[PDB]
Design a protein around this ligand. Structure first.
Ligand code: HEM
Ligand code: HEM
Ligand code: TRP
Ligand code: TRP
Ligand code: ZCW
Ligand code: CYN
Ligand code: CYN
Lengths: 365, 366
């Protein structure tokens, strides 16, 4: 449950970021950033505050770099921000750029402190532009994660059942896992009610983009006073969610095998997540293979239960491709004047088709 | 335990080509024997040991086929009757279908006298590429440095146990034991000068360890005919693919894989060029609380010095390693008519010095 306020010492940062949709319209955001002082991170108390502080320097860096978002960029980040950001990013073992765990996972609050985590009772902590649909987009993302995260607590039952040779317990656990992925798909449906296609594509989207393989910062960002040469880091995406990567690992879909670009991207995004998230994926891989266990057992009900989890991942990814049609492909086709790139930096159609197809190949006959 | 030395009779056609690479390459007839092979199922490799020896046999054959005599006439297509079982076997072991450190060092040896110790003069390799290539001395000394470094692996649990039990004295003795294993390993590394000739290594053996990822001679990769339709790119071998040698940076909190740079990228990438148990061990080491944070918070000069003996021994290993690079690459490269590439594909001088300096910066200044 994420902190909403930093100490008053950091009040200078909190103001630029909570009043970001208007500093940006008024073309005075670059100056107020450039008119800041290098406030040291020593006055950051617990983890909560440090996560919040990262989300604050993240939205500010993205605001500074992309500005109005229609071409006028800044290839150099002032030391007033770059140094504290980079110091706090090294402490959290993260790159100095906004990542999924910042802008989705630390970026919310509930209205009634003891009423359920539903879209009506929740709100985001930070926006970029008026009408960007950032609340609908960040919160539906968070809601889908939460729904799929329900299966995390059954994963230990899966491995215990295997090591103890508990066939009925294994089968019920896999069906429960498939059940949660189906619910996460239903939650996904709500994105249509809260995110507008044109607003997402032309307003919000560029604030999530990064400087890794981006022609508009073909050398990356230079973090003044921390590194002399510029560095490249990828923009955000849910490819940076350990929850969504974890189902492939759990089921023995080897998304990170083979040496290709999609495999390379998914492995790379694991050091764009908090170390505990990356460690969870590690620990999952270190266990015996759920897939290899089910394959060897000559058991139709167990095979069918395993297949239910893979079908549900295919359903998610195909629905997600239709989300892509409506929120990227069509809006891109509807604007004044060569391969469509994701905020994470990928050749998005080939990447997404490769990942779905790899899922598909895991379906057991 | 000991690597398997023979495959089932079913795979005799493989074993024959892998055991006779010096003469088959020299005589100009290795590729024709490979191209005339039959496709053999991998379904007769029953246990893990046979699969490991099979990967080594197939890996050496693949390098000999692609590189040939090692002076330019390369092959960009790997014939299906090798490609297909090689790719299937590789998939089962979660390894790329190219020769890696775990094949040509960790599985490429046997002892002469069973009840005698693992020392250079009681050991031998299973496969070589070319007459006069120093592969025997090169692979065995590499293994010997690994075995000496690996004696530290069994004290690693004591380290994390000592931390959580607040067992200060036990921690210190464990860290000193580790620094001692790493100094042992630096001593065994001296054996390389006695069994590897620099000219043979550089101009004869090195080309057989090189791969097809960012490599001029095979700019799109290699086609594994009959198994994937498009060429695939894989890096060549190096001890960057040893979990033993990466694990000390992890245990000591030296963040060699942080920062997004090339060296970090290479060292993380090599973790899927090592068997899964090896990879799991690295990231499990990364799951544990930081030894470095523990020592730094304790105000204990003895603790800090035991940690620093470890960092310093790593620095000595890598500085000596830079001299071996001068003797076996830079001098032989100058000695015959952009930036020198290692068999692993790195810009090796920037890369090795970046990794050395990241070690140096971990020394306790307090
Ligand atoms: C407007 C809505 C969305 C758009 C346009 C979109 C687009 C994309 C793009 C372009 C990529 C490729 C990576 C890159 O270069 O950025 C990607 C990957 C990914 N996205 Fe989305 N996304 C949206 C919402 C979501 C949501 C709500 C989820 C939550 C389940 C999600 C889950 C994923 C995952 C897990 C990946 C990695 C690929 C995979 O595992 O299939 N996305 N997405
Ligand atoms: C003739 C002998 C050797 C030469 C010429 C050599 C050269 C190189 C090169 C060029 C690299 C860069 C990666 C690449 O692109 O290949 C490298 C990395 C590395 N080498 Fe060697 N190497 C030799 C023997 C050894 C041995 C015996 C060890 C045993 C400890 C070792 C340990 C390492 C390690 C651990 C790395 C990864 C970088 C690091 O962690 O410092 N090397 N070496
Ligand atoms: N990757 C998406 C943007 C995106 C969607 N969900 C995200 C969550 C976090 C960061 C970025 C995103 C795109 O290219 O359009
Ligand atoms: N990387 C070394 C070759 C090498 C040394 N030790 C190895 C162990 C395994 C594979 C290759 C190697 C080079 O560029 O010359
Ligand atoms: O690209 C499809 C999005 C996706 C992949 N894996 C998931 C797991 C749970 C919820 C969504 C996804
Ligand atoms: C989706 N990113
Ligand atoms: C050393 N490779």
């Amino acid at each position: 449950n994420p902190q909403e306020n930093l100490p008053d010492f950091y009040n200078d940062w909190m103001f630029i970021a909570k009043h970001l949709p208007d500093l940006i319209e008024s073309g005075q955001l670059r100056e107020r950033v450039e008119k800041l002082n290098m406030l040291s991170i020593d006055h950051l108390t617990d983890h909560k505050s440090q996560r919040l502080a990262r989300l604050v320097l993240g939205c500010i860096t993205m605001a500074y770099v992309w500005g109005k978002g229609h071409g006028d960029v800044r290839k150099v980040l002032p030391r007033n921000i770059a140094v504290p950001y980079c110091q706090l990013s090294k402490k959290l073992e993260l790159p100095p750029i906004l990542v999924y765990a910042d802008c989705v996972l630390a970026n919310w609050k509930k209205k009634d402190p003891n009423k359920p985590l539903t879209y009506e009772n929740m709100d985001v902590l930070f926006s970029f532009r008026d009408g960007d649909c950032s609340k609908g987009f960040f919160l539906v993302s968070l809601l889908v994660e939460i729904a799929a995260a329900s299966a995390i607590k059954v994963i230990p039952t899966v491995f215990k059942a295997m090591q103890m040779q508990e066939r009925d317990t294994l089968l019920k656990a896999l069906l429960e896992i498939a059940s949660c992925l189906e619910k996460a798909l239903q939650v996904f449906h709500q994105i249509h009610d809260h995110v507008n296609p044109k607003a997402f594509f032309s307003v919000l989207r560029i604030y999530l983009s990064g400087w890794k393989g981006n022609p508009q910062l073909s050398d990356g960002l230079v973090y003044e006073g921390f590194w002399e040469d510029p560095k490249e880091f990828a923009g955000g995406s849910a490819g940076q969610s350990s929850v969504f990567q974890c189902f492939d690992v759990l089921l023995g879909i080897q998304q990170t095998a083979g040496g290709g670009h999609a495999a390379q991207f998914l492995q790379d995004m694991r050091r764009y997540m908090p170390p505990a998230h990356r460690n969870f994926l590690c620990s999952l891989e270190s266990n015996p293979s759920v897939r290899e266990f089910v394959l060897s057992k000559g058991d139709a009900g167990l095979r069918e239960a395993y297949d239910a989890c893979v079908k549900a991942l295919v359903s998610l990814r195909s629905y997600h491709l239709q989300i892509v049609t409506k929120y990227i492909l069509i809006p891109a086709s509807q604007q004044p004047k060569l391969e469509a790139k994701g905020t994470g930096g990928t050749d998005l159609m080939n990447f997404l088709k490769t990942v779905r197809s790899t899922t598909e190949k895991s379906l057991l006959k």
